[PDB]
Amino acid sequence: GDKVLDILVKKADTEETANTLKNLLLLFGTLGMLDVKQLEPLILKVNAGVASAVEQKFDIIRSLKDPEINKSITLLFSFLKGMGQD
Amino acid sequence: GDKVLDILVKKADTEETANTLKNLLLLFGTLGMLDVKQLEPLILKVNAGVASAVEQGYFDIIRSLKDPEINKSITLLFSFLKGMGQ
Amino acid sequence: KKTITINGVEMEASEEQTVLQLLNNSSIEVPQVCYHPSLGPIETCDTCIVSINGELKRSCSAELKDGDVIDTLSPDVKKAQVIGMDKILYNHELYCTVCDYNNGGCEIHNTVKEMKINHQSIPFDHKPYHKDESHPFYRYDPDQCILCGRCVEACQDVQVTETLTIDWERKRPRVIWDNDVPINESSCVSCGHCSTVCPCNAMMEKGMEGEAGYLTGINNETLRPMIEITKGVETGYGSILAISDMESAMRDERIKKTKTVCTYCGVGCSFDVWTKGRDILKVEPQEEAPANGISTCVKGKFGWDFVNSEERLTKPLIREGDHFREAEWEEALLLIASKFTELKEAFGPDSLAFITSSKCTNEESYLMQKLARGVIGTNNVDNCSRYCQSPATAGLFRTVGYGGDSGSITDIAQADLVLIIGSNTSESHPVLSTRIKRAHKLRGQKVIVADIRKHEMAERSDLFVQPRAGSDIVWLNAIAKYLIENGKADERFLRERVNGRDEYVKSLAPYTLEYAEEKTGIDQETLIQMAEMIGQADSVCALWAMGVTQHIGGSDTSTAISNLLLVTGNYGKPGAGSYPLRGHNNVQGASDFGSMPDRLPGYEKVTDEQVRQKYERVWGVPLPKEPGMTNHEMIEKIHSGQLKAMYVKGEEMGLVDSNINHVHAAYEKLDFFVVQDIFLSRTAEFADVVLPASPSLEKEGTFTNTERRIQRLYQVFEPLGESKPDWQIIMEVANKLGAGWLYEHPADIMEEAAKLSPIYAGVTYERLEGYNSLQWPVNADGKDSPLLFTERFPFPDGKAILYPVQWTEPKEFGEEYDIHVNNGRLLEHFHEGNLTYKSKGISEKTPEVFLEISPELAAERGIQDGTLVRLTSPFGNVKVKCLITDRVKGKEVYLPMNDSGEAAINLLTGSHADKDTDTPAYKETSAKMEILKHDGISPLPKINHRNGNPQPQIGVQVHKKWARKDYIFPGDAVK
Ligand SMILES: Nc1nc2c(c(=O)[nH]1)N[C@H]1C(S)=C(S)[C@@H](COP(=O)(O)OP(=O)(O)OC[C@H]3O[C@@H](n4cnc5c(=O)[nH]c(N)nc54)[C@H](O)[C@@H]3O)O[C@H]1N2
Ligand SMILES: Nc1nc2c(c(=O)[nH]1)N[C@H]1C(S)=C(S)[C@@H](COP(=O)(O)OP(=O)(O)OC[C@H]3O[C@@H](n4cnc5c(=O)[nH]c(N)nc54)[C@H](O)[C@@H]3O)O[C@H]1N2
Ligand SMILES: CCCCCCCCCCCCCC(=O)O
Ligand code: SF4
Ligand code: SF4
Ligand code: SF4
Ligand code: SF4
Ligand code: FES
Ligand SMILES: [Mo+4]
Ligand SMILES: [S]
């Protein structure tokens, strides 16, 4: 075990492996701040978008008006409004 | 063990650590709603985009738009926006 | 009055001189990494930054003035504390989970935790020095050193060795030993102070290295990358501090911390032993320790190897012809009972002597005398106090009535003057000497040293007089005559508190300044200075030891010291008194419990029919009325066919009694000899039965130190093999003779003895729990006596007695014996070294005995270091290597006791003893020197502390740190 641990620690001593473990722990702390409780409706909407994007066959101007489009682009603008706090 | 658990619980009692565990459990529930079965084609397309991005003004945005490769992506992006709306 | 407002709330200040002292008593949070109450303020860590009236100031040094508005919570005061901590953390690497100092008591660890620190502003940079692991007992890790100067304050101003200093003038400051030499080669006396007071692992005992933690055993090759991995990964300090706290808590399973009282000398140091299984990790001293505080010497701090020595006796030995047979405990006890009963029936009870050990506990002394008087029926009991301060107790009994020191070690550190007569105080009572050295060095206490050898106390004394061997009473009587006749004696004291004054002044008649200058050799002018210093000092403590008592007139010279103190009025008041420094760890307690031929416990005379009758009712048997033999007298009675048996416990009589050729001759004649010891001592070789006894760490009980301070022992280890603690053995021997004793713990023995001994009436184990102590006389109400004779002297009229004493000329050996062989001990070694030679770290720096030769005598006889010579006296001869030093002068040499063969000092000594107390005159030994070999390796290695180069100074020199360009006070970080 003394040799196995010696090999293990010596190979993990690289600053590439240290960063991987450092950011893995910090990633959980980041996820703790992220309010995933209120993500429920957003995930259901992004789910419905993925479903419609698989059924495929100046158009940018024509498409920017549809009732389905307006709900999404206004929600996208509402998301940008939220990112303006202190 | 009584002291080890006392130290462990007392250090984890912080609101910051409680939120991290709360959102970790909530994250799995969010993933349960997310239809990752239908993500297969979307992931293959995002994969092909990353591959082409590795291989390296105002006048160019006009030229690049309506291109055969571009049109397929921007119409799929518009189709995704159409889905988000109930 | 002194009213102060701390953090808004107003409060009344009590006796706190500093702001930090008040904050601590008020339970207000304030970092103090470099503050240790035993050392005082240092101003090095800069973490106690509080705002005294808006000004950011270090609270440890800030004097608490009346009407001060101190704040310890504003964002600026906290931002200043963290800045000071950042510099500590830049000089100290936190690796707690894999650090041996992560035992919950690490001041850096708990300060980082207390300060809710998560990041380190200044990254840890390694210092450009390697670890100084040269010393056998402790090591320096400069990379972990925060330069707090706690070790420097301890070495300089507490221990007063002056080895440690901090090179502030260097690019990267570092703790220096002497003029930056390796620890082993320096003057470091290995006291342990520096590791004890160090707030982190920077100065640690080698015993702790790799032992204390669960992950500290991992080789540094694997552990170093683990620390580097963890350092990189780390999210915050609090996360990995919690992991380290859980591991620190787990250590409680393996590491056992037990309070004990030092088994070595009479200073009575108590401390905790940290043991992982049978391994002693470190001797951790405590501030609550009544006699020593955080102070220790090499013997108590690091000299415990003997307890685990492979040479420890674990099975009783019964002599089978030309060898010892290992035998069962039952057969050894049955043989002792059969032979003791045989000699008691055929030759009487007085044909059996019993020797108590002053190394053993109070209860063990009590049981040895209960066996001798209550079971065997003889008063033939005694202890090593016979060769020791028996003349000093005779002197105190004649004048002040109590067989103990006048006060505590605290009174010695308080004294205006300390008169030291024939006492190597820093080597024989090191922790007691640290109080004198500190008082003289810092408080300006006057120290007078009367001695024939220039030791540390002589080198540091205000006045060092060198009287001729045995002439001490001549100058002592002359000081009293001059002070009485010049009107400088305390006549108010002598009046209402003393008796026999006119008869005393009549006996002082021959001791004129001319006679004193003629006999002692001390000139009249310096004799005036001694008398003026003694007289003008408000409080005088007179400390004497074997230089005074190991003489034919030893009892009288001791009486002269007490008489002088009576004259100058130095009794019944703090800072003054008679202090005959008690030898062994428990010599005071062994005598306190009746291990003398003439007295029962509590010093109640044996011939006192009223005392005897009290013990007869309690013990249920008649006590012998006639007194017994002394320890010295016992060998004479074997030679004259009067003593057929001897039961000697923990005493190396075959080497420590005078004239060991005559001692050994009496051992061959002796019918039955039982030696009870932890090792097969020189004495044990002459035994018919050897009983394996267990040392202090393997038993419970109490010890009484030089201050009459009864202190309790807790069991550190269980008795090794079949070795039993001495009380258990004595009890089992008595039970084999039909005693029917039913003790289960030494506390049962103490309860019986406290009822009988009046001076111990109020002593109970409950009153001695933990670091609690009691100084006798202790009345039944538990009220002790820290300072004797405050109200009255213990005589029928409450008055002390001036005792007429005459000079008894020291024994002259003959004109052919021109070398006066002075003898004693060494700081590091305890007697012949049965205990200290087992400590390999002590052996490493002092491997052997040596004969100190003066440069004068070495020039005359052509002696160099290592020259084998032969000192021959009319009693025997020693062959010993030589060591030249100005510690000895002219034809007086010095032969320490640390040898068990060819160089045993007691081969030279004669059986001539004190006329009143039979204490062998060891300081009256003459011999003739014959060169045997010219070339030999020096008997004192380069690494011995005596080959050092101290760097004396007051404090840490923190002003040198502040003078640097890089120094920026944390408080000054405002704009
Ligand atoms: N390190 C250590 N400490 C010990 C011990 C030990 O073995 N090792 N043993 C313990 C025991 S049992 C004892 S009793 C005490 C002994 O404690 P001390 O009595 O302090 O010790 P020693 O060095 O034996 O005493 C001799 C001292 O008296 C001086 N001296 C010799 N002759 C005279 C003289 O005629 N007049 C004067 N004025 N001075 C003289 C010597 O030079 C030396 O300084 O120490 C106890 N402490
Ligand atoms: N030439 C000369 N001779 C002297 C002196 C001097 O200055 N010069 N000093 C004299 C004086 S003051 C004294 S007190 C004596 C010292 O003489 P001793 O009192 O004989 O001293 P130490 O050599 O410490 O002997 C202690 C013994 O006790 C044993 N021991 C230790 N702990 C225990 C325990 O718990 N139980 C048992 N049963 N045994 C234990 C040790 O192994 C060792 O054999 O020397 C005296 N002899
Ligand atoms: C008994 C095993 C000793 C060998 C292991 C050496 C590691 C000791 C742990 C102390 C902390 C490591 C010291 C350091 O990294 O500076
Ligand atoms: S000495 Fe104290 S602060 Fe330093 S690593 Fe060890 S436990 Fe932590
Ligand atoms: S060695 Fe001295 S200066 Fe360094 S941390 Fe220890 S006590 Fe402080
Ligand atoms: S004498 Fe040695 S062990 Fe004692 S404090 Fe000084 S340097 Fe440290
Ligand atoms: S001074 Fe005496 S009691 Fe204190 S540690 Fe040293 S030997 Fe032990
Ligand atoms: S305790 Fe005040 S600066 Fe260190
Ligand atoms: Mo002694
Ligand atoms: S002693």
Side-chain angles (χ1 to χ4, degrees), chain A, chain B, chain C residues 2-975:
Chain A
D2 53 298
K3 301 197 276 240
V4 175
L5 185 63
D6 196 30
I7 301 163
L8 178 57
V9 174
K10 280 169 166 174
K11 305 310 156 305
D13 194 18
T14 71
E15 308 309 318
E16 307 82 78
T17 322
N19 267 336
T20 289
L21 306 162
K22 172 188 206 166
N23 291 155
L24 174 58
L25 260 69
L26 297 170
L27 200 71
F28 300 137
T30 290
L31 290 189
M33 307 188 294
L34 223 146
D35 202 325
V36 297
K37 173 196 174 185
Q38 55 178 210
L39 249 62
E40 293 174 283
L42 181 62
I43 295 300
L44 275 177
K45 302 304 149 198
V46 301
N47 230 16
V50 165
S52 63
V54 304
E55 307 162 301
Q56 298 299 310
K57 307 180 288 184
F58 46 88
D59 292 332
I60 303 172
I61 311 151
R62 302 184 198 188
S63 50
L64 276 170
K65 203 59 215 173
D66 293 19
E68 301 283 338
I69 293 298
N70 185 52
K71 200 187 297 182
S72 308
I73 57 178
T74 46
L75 252 64
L76 184 60
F77 263 125
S78 306
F79 176 78
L80 297 159
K81 183 164 180 76
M83 307 191 296
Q85 319 299 134
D86 299 341
Chain B
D2 54 298
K3 301 198 276 240
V4 175
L5 185 63
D6 196 31
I7 301 162
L8 179 58
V9 303
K10 280 169 166 174
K11 305 309 155 52
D13 196 17
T14 71
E15 190 200 271
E16 311 290 282
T17 322
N19 268 335
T20 289
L21 306 162
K22 172 187 205 168
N23 291 155
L24 174 58
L25 260 70
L26 252 54
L27 200 71
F28 300 137
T30 290
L31 139 86
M33 307 188 73
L34 224 146
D35 201 325
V36 297
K37 173 195 176 181
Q38 56 179 24
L39 249 63
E40 293 173 70
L42 180 62
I43 295 299
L44 275 177
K45 301 304 149 198
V46 164
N47 230 16
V50 165
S52 63
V54 170
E55 191 60 46
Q56 306 153 349
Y58 167 76
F59 316 95
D60 295 332
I61 304 170
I62 311 149
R63 302 183 199 188
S64 51
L65 276 169
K66 239 186 295 289
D67 195 82
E69 303 282 338
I70 293 297
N71 185 52
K72 199 185 293 186
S73 308
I74 56 179
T75 46
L76 252 65
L77 184 59
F78 263 124
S79 306
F80 176 78
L81 297 159
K82 183 166 254 159
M84 303 183 63
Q86 212 179 151
Chain C
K2 212 175 291 186
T3 314
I4 280 98
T5 168
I6 43 191
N7 270 125
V9 283
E10 185 192 14
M11 80 160 298
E12 190 81 18
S14 314
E15 284 55 52
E16 310 104 350
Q17 309 172 307
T18 80
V19 176
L20 185 86
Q21 280 184 41
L22 169 67
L23 289 173
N24 283 350
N25 294 358
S26 318
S27 299
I28 303 176
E29 207 201 280
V30 58
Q32 44 191 272
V33 176
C34 80
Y35 182 77
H36 190 288
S38 297
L39 311 171
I42 309 178
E43 313 171 272
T44 44
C45 70
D46 305 342
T47 59
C48 54
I49 318 295
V50 311
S51 67
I52 322 288
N53 316 107
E55 299 273 341
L56 282 175
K57 199 186 185 182
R58 309 193 245 260
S59 53
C60 63
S61 58
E63 194 198 319
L64 191 59
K65 310 193 201 64
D66 188 11
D68 273 2
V69 191
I70 307 137
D71 170 84
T72 72
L73 285 166
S74 80
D76 282 341
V77 315
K78 292 299 176 197
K79 275 185 291 181
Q81 295 180 348
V82 171
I83 281 172
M85 186 74 227
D86 276 315
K87 262 296 184 195
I88 292 177
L89 294 182
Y90 153 71
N91 285 329
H92 181 86
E93 183 171 39
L94 295 174
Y95 50 84
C96 314
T97 323
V98 296
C99 174
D100 299 284
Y101 210 64
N102 177 48
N103 301 304
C106 182
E107 283 156 274
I108 291 180
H109 181 264
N110 322 333
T111 302
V112 171
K113 186 164 61 167
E114 166 194 319
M115 300 181 72
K116 305 188 83 175
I117 284 166
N118 270 77
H119 328 314
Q120 187 175 309
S121 300
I122 323 178
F124 171 70
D125 192 29
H126 293 87
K127 291 190 191 54
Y129 315 91
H130 304 99
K131 289 198 239 165
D132 200 326
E133 308 173 312
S134 57
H135 199 264
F137 294 138
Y138 72 98
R139 73 97 184 85
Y140 185 58
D141 187 347
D143 295 18
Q144 298 295 105
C145 183
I146 60 169
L147 300 153
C148 73
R150 279 159 61 137
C151 60
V152 173
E153 259 306 322
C155 201
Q156 295 278 161
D157 307 337
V158 179
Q159 165 70 10
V160 194
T161 275
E162 305 151 337
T163 292
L164 310 176
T165 54
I166 291 173
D167 194 346
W168 301 112
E169 307 172 21
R170 199 186 290 203
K171 299 175 183 187
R172 258 280 200 183
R174 173 242 214 262
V175 175
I176 267 187
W177 273 256
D178 291 5
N179 266 133
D180 200 19
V181 312
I183 306 173
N184 215 25
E185 301 178 6
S186 79
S187 63
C188 170
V189 295
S190 322
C191 73
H193 273 98
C194 53
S195 298
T196 293
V197 309
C198 182
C200 60
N201 71 326
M203 285 248 74
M204 190 164 78
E205 299 83 350
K206 287 178 163 186
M208 292 283 290
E209 282 187 304
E211 298 321 302
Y214 283 94
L215 308 180
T216 68
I218 296 172
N219 320 118
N220 207 54
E221 196 207 27
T222 306
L223 205 60
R224 199 68 233 177
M226 254 166 73
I227 291 164
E228 299 300 328
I229 289 168
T230 307
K231 276 168 65 187
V233 172
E234 260 171 278
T235 66
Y237 274 136
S239 274
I240 194 62
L241 266 168
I243 300 294
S244 74
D245 272 357
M246 299 178 225
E247 191 268 336
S248 169
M250 288 181 220
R251 303 189 183 198
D252 284 341
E253 184 74 26
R254 46 169 45 173
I255 308 150
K256 180 188 174 176
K257 302 158 195 192
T258 314
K259 188 248 170 164
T260 200
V261 185
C262 187
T263 194
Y264 285 104
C265 89
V267 176
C269 296
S270 56
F271 32 62
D272 291 346
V273 190
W274 282 37
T275 68
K276 182 177 69 165
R278 261 218 157 242
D279 291 305
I280 300 181
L281 265 62
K282 75 171 174 176
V283 159
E284 170 89 329
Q286 296 291 106
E287 309 182 48
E288 318 108 75
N292 57 303
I294 52 90
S295 290
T296 55
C297 86
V298 62
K299 290 172 300 171
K301 180 72 172 184
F302 299 120
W304 294 101
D305 275 13
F306 73 90
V307 81
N308 294 299
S309 178
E310 49 275 11
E311 296 172 46
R312 280 284 314 275
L313 304 181
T314 53
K315 190 83 166 234
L317 300 169
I318 304 178
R319 174 186 297 264
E320 180 169 80
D322 65 340
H323 65 254
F324 275 125
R325 158 170 54 91
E326 257 182 17
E328 291 298 337
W329 259 111
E330 178 79 358
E331 190 208 343
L333 292 165
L334 253 47
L335 175 61
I336 292 165
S338 299
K339 291 291 165 172
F340 274 24
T341 283
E342 177 190 333
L343 309 180
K344 173 175 154 190
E345 276 176 13
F347 313 126
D350 270 48
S351 69
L352 286 103
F354 296 88
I355 291 306
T356 285
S357 182
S358 305
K359 275 270 159 287
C360 290
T361 78
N362 293 341
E363 300 80 16
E364 301 170 346
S365 165
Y366 181 80
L367 287 196
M368 184 58 108
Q369 62 93 39
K370 194 178 176 175
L371 170 68
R373 307 171 161 132
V375 182
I376 302 300
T378 180
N379 267 293
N380 285 347
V381 268
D382 211 4
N383 70 290
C384 70
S385 194
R386 182 61 53 220
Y387 317 129
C388 200
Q389 62 280 303
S390 193
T393 44
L396 301 174
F397 275 135
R398 289 163 171 185
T399 62
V400 298
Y402 275 151
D405 292 36
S406 304
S408 305
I409 293 169
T410 324
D411 293 312
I412 301 183
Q414 269 190 39
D416 268 65
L417 188 131
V418 173
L419 167 62
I420 307 168
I421 321 147
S423 166
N424 194 353
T425 318
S426 81
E427 297 201 69
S428 291
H429 298 82
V431 168
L432 193 144
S433 82
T434 64
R435 311 300 163 203
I436 304 172
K437 278 187 278 184
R438 171 174 177 92
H440 171 273
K441 171 167 176 173
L442 313 175
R443 300 148 189 134
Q445 174 186 263
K446 308 291 174 148
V447 177
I448 289 174
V449 167
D451 209 294
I452 79 171
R453 178 165 168 248
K454 191 203 62 180
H455 49 60
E456 187 180 12
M457 298 302 279
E459 294 162 25
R460 299 187 184 271
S461 64
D462 270 321
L463 175 59
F464 176 37
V465 314
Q466 322 205 37
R468 303 188 164 117
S471 65
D472 295 289
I473 188 171
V474 171
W475 65 262
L476 277 157
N477 276 337
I479 300 299
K481 181 181 171 294
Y482 177 93
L483 284 168
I484 281 168
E485 293 169 354
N486 262 266
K488 296 148 161 294
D490 197 327
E491 302 284 3
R492 179 157 171 87
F493 184 95
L494 278 166
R495 229 155 62 206
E496 62 218 300
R497 306 198 69 172
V498 188
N499 280 324
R501 192 190 182 286
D502 297 84
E503 301 95 323
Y504 177 62
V505 188
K506 277 158 141 181
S507 69
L508 300 180
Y511 311 95
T512 193
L513 297 166
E514 204 127 10
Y515 183 73
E517 182 188 55
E518 208 257 308
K519 301 294 187 174
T520 77
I522 303 171
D523 62 75
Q524 309 186 35
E525 164 156 53
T526 57
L527 276 160
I528 307 302
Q529 195 205 318
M530 292 182 81
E532 289 289 358
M533 288 176 95
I534 291 178
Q536 275 146 15
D538 351 328
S539 45
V540 176
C541 280
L543 281 63
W544 74 100
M546 282 52 251
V548 161
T549 64
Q550 289 170 353
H551 284 285
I552 289 173
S555 285
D556 290 336
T557 317
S558 305
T559 314
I561 308 165
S562 204
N563 286 340
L564 175 62
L565 296 160
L566 285 173
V567 166
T568 174
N570 291 122
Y571 270 111
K573 62 155 143 195
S578 51
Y579 299 93
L581 302 181
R582 312 306 308 239
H584 270 286
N585 53 295
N586 193 29
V587 69
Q588 183 56 70
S591 304
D592 283 9
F593 282 77
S595 296
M596 294 141 311
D598 59 301
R599 286 169 206 265
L600 270 161
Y603 301 109
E604 294 203 293
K605 293 181 177 60
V606 157
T607 63
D608 201 286
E609 194 191 283
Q610 284 291 135
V611 166
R612 170 149 72 266
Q613 253 169 66
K614 171 178 61 180
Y615 280 92
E616 282 176 356
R617 284 183 309 271
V618 177
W619 294 358
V621 119
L623 267 76
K625 333 190 105 181
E626 84 296 339
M629 313 165 190
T630 76
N631 214 329
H632 202 214
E633 171 180 2
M634 277 163 196
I635 53 164
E636 316 299 298
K637 303 295 172 81
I638 300 178
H639 263 104
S640 62
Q642 316 209 248
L643 200 59
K644 311 302 223 84
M646 278 204 78
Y647 182 16
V648 176
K649 83 178 182 68
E651 184 190 271
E652 183 68 284
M653 200 182 173
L655 289 174
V656 310
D657 201 339
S658 62
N659 193 359
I660 60 171
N661 281 308
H662 187 219
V663 168
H664 297 158
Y667 284 163
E668 304 165 333
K669 291 185 151 208
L670 190 57
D671 247 311
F672 202 45
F673 195 24
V674 184
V675 172
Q676 178 165 303
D677 207 297
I678 72 173
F679 297 125
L680 192 99
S681 51
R682 185 70 176 95
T683 316
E685 298 175 17
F686 303 95
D688 294 279
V689 172
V690 184
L691 305 175
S694 295
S696 75
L697 302 187
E698 290 169 29
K699 67 194 182 185
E700 301 212 345
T702 51
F703 287 159
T704 306
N705 79 351
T706 205
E707 319 161 285
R708 300 154 289 113
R709 192 191 301 274
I710 313 142
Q711 306 197 251
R712 184 182 173 183
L713 272 77
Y714 291 88
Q715 198 192 270
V716 175
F717 304 124
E718 273 148 25
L720 195 80
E722 289 183 44
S723 63
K724 309 180 177 224
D726 298 78
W727 67 274
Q728 190 177 324
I729 309 178
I730 308 165
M731 180 186 146
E732 282 171 24
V733 173
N735 285 341
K736 282 298 160 189
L737 300 166
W741 297 353
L742 301 167
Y743 315 103
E744 295 148 81
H745 186 264
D748 291 354
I749 311 170
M750 180 55 100
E751 278 175 61
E752 173 186 317
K755 295 173 180 199
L756 291 146
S757 167
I759 72 168
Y760 270 73
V763 320
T764 57
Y765 270 48
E766 190 185 20
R767 296 188 171 113
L768 305 174
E769 294 185 316
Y771 282 101
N772 284 294
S773 50
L774 286 177
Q775 306 188 52
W776 69 257
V778 185
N779 86 312
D781 306 293
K783 308 157 181 175
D784 70 339
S785 310
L787 183 61
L788 293 186
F789 328 115
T790 49
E791 309 271 26
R792 66 164 238 157
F793 287 91
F795 281 121
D797 66 325
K799 279 200 271 163
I801 302 168
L802 273 165
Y803 199 92
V805 288
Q806 305 297 324
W807 180 46
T808 312
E809 288 203 46
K811 183 136 161 179
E812 266 307 319
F813 278 45
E815 73 159 43
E816 55 180 311
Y817 308 112
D818 65 321
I819 288 111
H820 172 74
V821 49
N822 174 27
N823 52 92
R825 9 232 134 199
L826 300 174
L827 161 65
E828 51 268 60
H829 276 121
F830 201 88
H831 296 132
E832 76 303 295
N834 281 3
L835 284 34
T836 45
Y837 277 126
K838 313 289 150 68
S839 178
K840 305 309 168 188
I842 284 175
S843 280
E844 170 173 325
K845 305 169 63 82
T846 310
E848 49 176 323
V849 75
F850 51 86
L851 184 63
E852 290 191 340
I853 291 297
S854 78
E856 169 181 344
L857 204 64
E860 184 186 353
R861 307 237 155 86
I863 290 173
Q864 52 154 66
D865 292 335
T867 285
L868 175 65
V869 309
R870 186 201 293 264
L871 301 180
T872 320
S873 91
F875 313 97
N877 73 91
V878 310
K879 305 184 166 52
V880 52
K881 278 193 188 160
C882 290
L883 177 72
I884 323 178
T885 181
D886 49 35
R887 285 189 284 272
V888 300
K889 56 186 159 65
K891 295 210 195 244
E892 311 161 340
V893 303
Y894 183 76
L895 180 66
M897 289 170 72
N898 61 314
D899 191 83
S900 306
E902 272 191 332
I905 175 68
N906 274 314
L907 287 158
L908 299 182
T909 66
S911 57
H912 59 278
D914 181 270
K915 55 141 177 300
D916 320 282
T917 204
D918 220 35
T919 292
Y922 302 110
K923 310 298 186 243
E924 286 170 11
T925 306
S926 316
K928 40 168 178 136
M929 184 168 56
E930 172 215 334
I931 317 292
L932 307 174
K933 286 201 66 176
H934 292 119
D935 255 22
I937 226 73
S938 186
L940 206 68
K942 181 180 61 181
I943 54 175
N944 187 271
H945 75 274
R946 290 166 198 91
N947 280 3
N949 185 25
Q951 305 289 124
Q953 75 190 21
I954 301 299
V956 178
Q957 311 290 273
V958 66
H959 55 268
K960 294 201 179 49
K961 176 192 179 163
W962 307 336
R964 298 164 55 90
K965 185 175 190 170
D966 68 354
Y967 186 85
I968 300 163
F969 178 65
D972 292 335
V974 169
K975 190 181 178 179

